[PDB]
Design a protein around this ligand. Structure first.
Ligand SMILES: *[C@@H]1O[C@H](CO)[C@@H](O[C@@H]2O[C@H](CO)[C@@H](O[C@@H]3O[C@H](CO[C@H]4O[C@H](CO[C@H]5O[C@H](CO)[C@@H](O)[C@H](O)[C@@H]5O[C@H]5O[C@H](CO)[C@@H](O)[C@H](O)[C@@H]5O)[C@@H](O)[C@H](O[C@H]5O[C@H](CO)[C@@H](O)[C@H](O)[C@@H]5O)[C@@H]4O)[C@@H](O)[C@H](O[C@H]4O[C@H](CO)[C@@H](O)[C@H](O)[C@@H]4O[C@H]4O[C@H](CO)[C@@H](O)[C@H](O)[C@@H]4O[C@H]4O[C@H](CO)[C@@H](O)[C@H](O)[C@@H]4O)[C@@H]3O)[C@H](O)[C@H]2NC(C)=O)[C@H](O)[C@H]1NC(C)=O
Ligand SMILES: *[C@@H]1O[C@H](CO)[C@@H](O[C@@H]2O[C@H](CO)[C@@H](O[C@@H]3O[C@H](CO[C@H]4O[C@H](CO[C@H]5O[C@H](CO)[C@@H](O)[C@H](O)[C@@H]5O[C@H]5O[C@H](CO)[C@@H](O)[C@H](O)[C@@H]5O)[C@@H](O)[C@H](O[C@H]5O[C@H](CO)[C@@H](O)[C@H](O)[C@@H]5O)[C@@H]4O)[C@@H](O)[C@H](O[C@H]4O[C@H](CO)[C@@H](O)[C@H](O)[C@@H]4O[C@H]4O[C@H](CO)[C@@H](O)[C@H](O)[C@@H]4O[C@H]4O[C@H](CO)[C@@H](O)[C@H](O)[C@@H]4O)[C@@H]3O)[C@H](O)[C@H]2NC(C)=O)[C@H](O)[C@H]1NC(C)=O
Ligand SMILES: *[C@@H]1O[C@H](CO)[C@@H](O[C@@H]2O[C@H](CO)[C@@H](O[C@@H]3O[C@H](CO[C@H]4O[C@H](CO)[C@@H](O)[C@H](O[C@H]5O[C@H](CO)[C@@H](O)[C@H](O)[C@@H]5O)[C@@H]4O)[C@@H](O)[C@H](O[C@H]4O[C@H](CO)[C@@H](O)[C@H](O)[C@@H]4O[C@H]4O[C@H](CO)[C@@H](O)[C@H](O)[C@@H]4O)[C@@H]3O)[C@H](O)[C@H]2NC(C)=O)[C@H](O)[C@H]1NC(C)=O
Ligand SMILES: *[C@@H]1O[C@H](CO)[C@@H](O[C@@H]2O[C@H](CO)[C@@H](O[C@@H]3O[C@H](CO[C@H]4O[C@H](CO)[C@@H](O)[C@H](O[C@H]5O[C@H](CO)[C@@H](O)[C@H](O)[C@@H]5O)[C@@H]4O)[C@@H](O)[C@H](O[C@H]4O[C@H](CO)[C@@H](O)[C@H](O)[C@@H]4O[C@H]4O[C@H](CO)[C@@H](O)[C@H](O)[C@@H]4O)[C@@H]3O)[C@H](O)[C@H]2NC(C)=O)[C@H](O)[C@H]1NC(C)=O
Ligand SMILES: OC[C@H]1O[C@@](CO)(O[C@H]2O[C@H](CO)[C@@H](O)[C@H](O)[C@H]2O)[C@@H](O)[C@@H]1O
Ligand SMILES: OC[C@H]1O[C@@](CO)(O[C@H]2O[C@H](CO)[C@@H](O)[C@H](O)[C@H]2O)[C@@H](O)[C@@H]1O
Ligand SMILES: OC[C@H]1O[C@@](CO)(O[C@H]2O[C@H](CO)[C@@H](O)[C@H](O)[C@H]2O)[C@@H](O)[C@@H]1O
Ligand SMILES: OC[C@H]1O[C@@](CO)(O[C@H]2O[C@H](CO)[C@@H](O)[C@H](O)[C@H]2O)[C@@H](O)[C@@H]1O
Ligand code: NAG
Ligand code: NAG
Ligand code: NAG
Ligand code: NAG
Ligand code: NAG
Ligand code: NAG
Ligand code: NAG
Ligand code: NAG
Ligand code: NAG
Ligand code: NAG
Lengths: 624, 624
């Protein structure tokens, strides 16, 4: 095993465990110290204003298993510190018959048991578990734990009658899944159900959804309500909140609803951020965010989706969330988005970016798998004065339209997503910032034009506004992680409405994924404008490439170039002519970003271990 | 629920939990503070000379489940003190994927991990488990833990490759069971295998048996040897030590070998006690003690047996233990005998006495189930100058015979068992002792003759020597726990060689067992004697009746008389005439015995709990 990054890569499968630990590793984002991570969990803003973030964790392994909560905290979403206790950076782990198979995703009741922050989580035990298997009741249940030390440790309720697990009965038969409880307060839902509480007797101020589905008959999000305020054992099943069909799709802008939901959450937003009104704010919109399984040919069969919903009250004192329009939260290699409230009327969302090594060829050599996305403020994106001649506008696919009285303009409403400003400020302020001169891309434009300033490593951000003619057939974007032999091309093609990431040349290492990523982006044309604009922000962080368009569209992906000098960046142009011109302005390079884990040394590997021959006997975890 | 013990019992199933806690409860023996117990485990003499005793335990329940090690200690086998830690009187409990289904029986390596006492125990996980079920590999494995604080707590080795569990591969396919590791040193076995260690490479100073069997083909005791002295991870399978047939029986004196072994141990004894020679002591005998399953119509399908064995060395460097003769360790409601070495060349054995409430009618009202037997010294019983005309003598069923050179007398050899002298001394010294005048039972004898002194409660011992004519047809023995309406009759009938406990009148409460207990007792007739003698010792301790004959035969059983005055005792006589006389001498009553748990209050119940609806979902434990 040679680690010479000035020559072509050898056979890297001969390299030892964690020998490639720093080679492709993100530095500017949330990631475990080592080993396996997946879904964010247990997210809450603590009493001191800091953010507690948990995550599904399997230390000293590079596949999933013994799944536990790892945790850390931050005062600004950006610079983090690990918890360190008797189990290292873990704070909840399998320990009881009811959760021994894994401590799955959970969410926080901020004033819970004895007034302490309390997690409701999926506690798993033995038996077939999965949407394509024949799971039985009891394999997935829901349990409580609380913390008296602000998340350094958690105390589980005892096992037994009237204690853990607190939710165990399946609400319908033949579930595909029964997990990922999302606890939330909702003046909106309380107002809607206030006339029906005699029917159900459930009058608590907390609701909880549980994600799943029914075999052969599509996904389900099940709604529960806390039975009595200030009491946390009894949760009353109201009914299905969201019901979708077996592999139903709302269309090209909306992914596919698959067979089973995961990590679903419920929020209410307005143009400024989170909305906590009872229905009285006419600018507020109810949203559900959710993952779907088995409705996708690639990306681990996983779509992270969202839908705007209109709530209807059923006669049995339950709620139907009728989907009004439906979109995609991220179009790339990310999943398991969790959202949580943050003071100042914010709802903040973060997901998990998996690697692109699905055959597990270099995972041991990495010594880790996975990272988070950046933390994102959610809000209602409102575009005013939209031209009715915007192509495809009245499809109303992942947005809504409201005509002006005179019919000459439209107001467009959709889900907005933008990187939390704390992170943008810290990134910019800690970087070497190069403000770049505008560039007109015309007949003289090369295919690739390097920026006048270049990055110095694999940790940078780019911003640009691309102004296109209304009938352009030109393409433009950014090339990143670029040398002559390796590069990753981010293209937007207004004629097809497709944002793509072409990765055929991303790396000389052939075992990594190289498929083309794709997102749909609607450029809403403004009344009286003779052009249309794409605002693109791109973060390059080790192997992560995370793309944001117009505070709306997100696409996370991976690139693993071998060569030390595959760090360059610049502009891409295709079909730009004297007459079909692309004006690029607002160009900025931020070189360096932030060291997100200042207390950690560069190499936080502790080695990898094998569970031994019993792993195959038990059949629950891969074992490595 | 009335607790009036001066009138007939009402419907006691209406009584609350633990309302009958003290009513039938032993006071003078090892018993858990409350709840469920079964097999002794983890027995060893500590560095300070005290005895550590563990037991299979399920606190606050009255059926088996979450099976854990409860523990206590004693300096004299007799007066005990509970450990008290973070889990009360438990010291090992289910906590890892490999043992979450139960911490089953285990035994002690005295100088183990880092020089500390170390337990090798059966760690159980999910799946069908049982001799009549289709168990698979991995469900039962063997794991290590060690103590740095003399048994107050135990630290398990980590889960994984080269750590726990340390034995997981089945030595043959289709096992009926794979548990109860018994670790022991043996100069005998080391000497026998010394010429074969090249074949196996196993040269350690510890051996371990694991108890089981093969479906359809009888029980098996599997022998392992520690691979290297001072190292405790690697244990090498040598071969089957004991192989018996599917429900094979050696005869009327030997129970039945069933389909599966449990709690098996290996020892070597001589007339004085434990023998630690390499084979050079010609008075020493190799013994195996073991439980069998599914070879008995009653007594929970369980026989606690023993066999004298002759070891043969196989060509593959393993040992066959050929059964020379075979007996019964206890003929009544006891099982799961464990033996352990004690300083002064002793081997001490103790078992578990279950209740006689197999339909679980009053278990909740008790608030506990189970106790230990008394602790017993094992030795080789040798009877010299035995008459060749002793009936059935050359059957050599559970004994061996050696003729004198002239053929006029025989030396008989069998397993001896006697209550440890520490307990006999303490019992006698703390009791009110009444030495009773001898009684000739003849034509004038009533059926029942009360002793001249009577017990004052349900805690007493009786001794007597019954001298019978060589051709008697008379019966005699002891009645205990006796009033006019309730009593338990212990009879010996020399003509049939049967010791019986008749329990048709033991209690007015009809839900308890009332079947007749039976043991075979061989009165070895001495050359020149014109009579034959039965030395009977009986312990009455709450509901326990524990009978010892001639330091050889043991029979433990249960009686639950309701009436407060059903405490009396005396002599039984049947068919005694002027010519067929039974001379009773050495009669002594010890009233009171010892308070075995002086620190415990009378009622150590902490209530009972239910595991809730998930107990049936998981399907592992009853839940109560
Ligand atoms: C199979 O058997 C298993 C083993 O038995 C069993 O698991 C065990 O289950 C039991 C019962 O559910 C659990 O017991 C609970 O423990 C909770 C605390 O748990 C935390 O702390 C313990 C112990 O703490 C110490 O010991 C460890 C180990 O040495 C040290 O690390 C610590 O530093 C600490 O040491 C100090 O204290 C020691 C003595 O205790 C000293 O020796 C020492 O010197 C130190 O000073 C830990 O062991 C726990 O760790 C385990 O669990 C965590 C997850 O929780 C894991 O991460 C970890 O790996 C371990 O597995 C843990 O950290 C108790 O809170 C709980 O007590 C209450 O509940 C019951 C009711 O259910 C009540 O009886 C009792 O009164 C308590 O409730 C009161 O208090 C709470 C708030 O504090 C109130 O909400 C409640 O209403 C009530 O209030 C009362 O008082 C008020 C007045 O103040 C009054 O106003 C109220 O009205 C009311 O009266 C309970 O004891 C036990 O932890 C499990 N153990 C393990 C190892 O798993 C398993 O379930 C079984 N399985 C099956 C299938 O049956
Ligand atoms: C799923 O995830 C699960 C959770 O991660 C996982 O279970 C965990 O597995 C790990 C790894 O196997 C276990 O870690 C081991 O822990 C052993 C000690 O265990 C005992 O102590 C711990 C911790 O102790 C404290 O914390 C608790 C909780 O707060 C307190 O109650 C205590 O008071 C104590 O607190 C003090 O210390 C704290 C910090 O640690 C402070 O915060 C605090 O202020 C106090 O000061 C307990 O948690 C354990 O309890 C659990 O387990 C018991 C059974 O064991 C249960 O009954 C109980 O309910 C709990 O479940 C327990 O009591 C360590 O000994 C062990 O460390 C060694 O082994 C590894 C190799 O495997 C080495 O890396 C390491 O060096 C250690 O080995 C050295 O030491 C030993 C002798 O001491 C030598 O034999 C050895 O050779 C070596 O010697 C070295 O040093 C020598 C020089 O001195 C040198 O000469 C030698 O050459 C050599 O270098 C390991 O850390 C962990 O306990 C599990 N946790 C739980 C909760 O289960 C599970 O397996 C996962 N499942 C799957 C399927 O993957
Ligand atoms: C005295 O000790 C006991 C512990 O032994 C304490 O706890 C009680 O324990 C018993 C079991 O011994 C439990 O009985 C079982 O109850 C099941 C239904 O329970 C529900 O209804 C009752 C009645 O109002 C409620 O009290 C329960 O509420 C509690 O539990 C829920 C969780 O479900 C919590 O949310 C609450 O907060 C409470 O904690 C329940 O809502 C019942 O199904 C079960 O069924 C069988 O057993 C009986 C008797 O043998 C049969 O008649 C019946 O046919 C069922 O038999 C089964 O038997 C075999 C083998 O098991 C199976 O193969 C069959 O298919 C069949 O299913 C049983 O009756 C009791 O619920 C529980 N009480 C609790 C926790 O409060 C007592 O509390 C304690 N008392 C005191 C004063 O301390
Ligand atoms: C680097 O990290 C790893 C952790 O990832 C550390 O531990 C090693 O981990 C790997 C797995 O990543 C283990 O590989 C597996 O080994 C199995 C056979 O092992 C035995 O032989 C080896 C070789 O001499 C010994 O080292 C082992 O000894 C250790 O374990 C025993 C317990 O058994 C202990 O007693 C010892 O003390 C040691 O701790 C063993 O004796 C092997 O069966 C297993 O098989 C598959 O995997 C490969 C690769 O994918 C395939 O070629 C093969 O076909 C098998 O594939 C399976 O794949 C699928 C899915 O799993 C199944 O469906 C198939 O049916 C099929 O079974 C694998 O190769 C390795 O043993 C282990 N080493 C240890 C513990 O020492 C490294 O130590 C660490 N390195 C350093 C320097 O720190
Ligand atoms: O770590 C479990 C956690 O991850 C999610 C989201 O991806 O589920 C994954 O893990 C399950 C258990 O292996 C799989 O069945 C599932 O297909 C997979 O997506 C959460 O739903 C869960 O809490
Ligand atoms: O934030 C104002 C308002 O919202 C409520 C809704 O019941 O609480 C939400 O907002 C808090 C601040 O972000 C969160 O801590 C809380 O978890 C969330 O439910 C009100 O309590 C509050 O007055
Ligand atoms: O507590 C388990 C312990 O008891 C024994 C001896 O009786 O086994 C009993 O428990 C097993 C598990 O429920 C049963 O399969 C078995 O039939 C029963 O005798 C020990 O062998 C075991 O270690
Ligand atoms: O007891 C004398 C002699 O026996 C050995 C056998 O190797 O140890 C046994 O006896 C000890 C005392 O009862 C026990 O502690 C020990 O566990 C048992 O193997 C010798 O070590 C000792 O010299
Ligand atoms: C980058 O490195 C490779 C190999 O060292 C080299 O061929 C190339 O010229 C270098 N510089 C570039 C592409 O600017
Ligand atoms: C309420 O009605 C809906 C629609 O019929 C149904 O799915 C749900 O199960 C009902 N709730 C109950 C039975 O609690
Ligand atoms: C919205 O405006 C477009 C263009 O003016 C028109 O085609 C459509 O009918 C209008 N819809 C409504 C509801 O008025
Ligand atoms: C650098 O980053 C840190 C950590 O997020 C942040 O607190 C600090 O303000 C940043 N420095 C700037 C903006 O100059
Ligand atoms: C653009 O995207 C869609 C997928 O939504 C695809 O079917 C179409 O072929 C793409 N067109 C071009 C020109 O890339
Ligand atoms: C024992 O008690 C019962 C009921 O109180 C009574 O009938 C009997 O006479 C008492 N005394 C005896 C049997 O000596
Ligand atoms: C040794 O021989 C015996 C008798 O053939 C056999 O049962 C045992 O399995 C053998 N040991 C091995 C293969 O280790
Ligand atoms: C043992 O003694 C009896 C009676 O003297 C006799 O029947 C038998 O043959 C003797 N056995 C041997 C081996 O001498
Ligand atoms: C009473 O019993 C205790 C506890 O076993 C014992 O130590 C003491 O010697 C006994 N008293 C006597 C024999 O007088
Ligand atoms: C004595 O015991 C045996 C069982 O070993 C039995 O078959 C026989 O009938 C009994 N005989 C008498 C008279 O009790």
């Amino acid at each position: 095993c040679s680690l010479d990054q000035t020559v072509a890569p050898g056979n890297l499968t001969l390299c030892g465990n964690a020998t490639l630990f720093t080679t492709f590793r993100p530095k500017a984002r949330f990631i475990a110290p080592e080993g396996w991570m997946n879904a964010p969990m247990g997210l809450y803003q603590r009493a001191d204003g800091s953010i507690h973030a948990g995550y599904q964790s399997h230390p000293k392994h590079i596949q999933w298993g013994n799944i536990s909560q790892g945790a850390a905290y931050s005062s600004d979403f950006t610079s983090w510190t690990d918890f360190n206790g008797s189990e290292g950076y873990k704070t909840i782990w399998p320990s009881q018959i009811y959760d021994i198979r894994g401590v799955f995703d959970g969410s926080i009741i901020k004033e819970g048991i004895d007034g302490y922050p309390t997690i409701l989580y999926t506690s798993t035990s033995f038996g077939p578990l999965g949407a394509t298997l024949n799971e039985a009741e009891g394999t997935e249940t829901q349990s409580l734990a609380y913390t008296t030390d602000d998340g350094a440790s958690w105390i589980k309720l005892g096992y037994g009658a009237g204690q853990n697990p607190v939710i165990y009965e399946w609400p319908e038969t033949n579930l595909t899944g029964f997990r990922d409880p999302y606890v939330f307060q909702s003046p909106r839902l309380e107002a809607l159900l206030a006339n029906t509480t005699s029917i159900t007797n459930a009058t608590g101020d907390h609701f909880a959804t549980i994600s799943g589905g029914v075999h052969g008959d599509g996904a389900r999000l099940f709604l529960y309500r806390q039975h009595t305020t200030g009491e946390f054992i009894k949760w009353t099943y109201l009914g299905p909140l969201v019901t979708t069909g077996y592999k139903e799709s709302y269309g090209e802008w909306s992914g596919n609803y698959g067979i089973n939901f995961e990590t679903a959450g419920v929020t209410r937003l307005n143009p400024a951020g989170a909305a906590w009104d009872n229905g009285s704010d006419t600018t507020a919109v109810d949203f559900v965010t959710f993952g779907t399984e088995q409705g996708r040919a690639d990306h681990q069969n996983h779509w992270p989706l969202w839908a705007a919903v209109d709530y209807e009250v059923r006669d049995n004192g339950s709620i139907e969330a009728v989907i009004a329009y439906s979109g995609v939260q991220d179009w790339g290699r990310s999943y398991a988005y969790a959202s949580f409230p943050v003071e100042g009327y914010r709802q903040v969302s973060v997901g998990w970016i998996y690697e692109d090594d699905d055959n597990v060829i270099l995972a041991k050599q990495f010594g880790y798998q996975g990272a988070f996305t950046l933390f994102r403020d959610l809000f209602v994106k409102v575009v005013e004065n939209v031209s009715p001649s915007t192509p495809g506008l009245f499809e109303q696919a992942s947005w809504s339209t409201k005509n002006s009285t005179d019919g000459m303009s439209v107001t467009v409403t959709t889900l907005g997503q933008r990187v939390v400003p704390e992170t943008l400020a810290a990134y910019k302020g800690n970087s070497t910032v190069s403000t770049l001169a505008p560039v007109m891309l015309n007949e003289s434009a090369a295919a690739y034009t390097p920026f006048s300033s270049q990055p110095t490593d694999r940790f940078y951000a780019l911003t640009g506004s691309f102004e296109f003619g209304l009938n352009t057939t030109a393409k433009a974007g950014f090339r990143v992680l670029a040398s002559e032999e390796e590069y990753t091309d981010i293209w937007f093609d207004p004629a097809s409405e497709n944002l793509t990431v072409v990765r055929t040349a991303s790396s000389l290492i052939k075992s990594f994924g190289n498929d083309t990523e794709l997102a749909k982006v609607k450029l809403y044309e403004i009344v009286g404008a003779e052009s249309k604009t794409l605002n693109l922000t791109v973060f390059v962080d080790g192997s992560v490439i995370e793309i944001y368009a117009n505070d709306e569209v997100a696409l996370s992906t991976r690139a693993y170039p071998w060569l030390a000098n595959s760090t360059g960046a610049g502009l891409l142009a295709d079909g730009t002519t004297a007459g079909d011109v692309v004006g690029v302005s607002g160009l900025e390079l931020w070189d360096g970003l932030v060291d997100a884990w200042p207390a950690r040394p560069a190499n936080t590997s502790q080695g990898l271990v094998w569970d031994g021959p019993t792993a195959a006997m038990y059949g629950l975890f891969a074992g490595y």
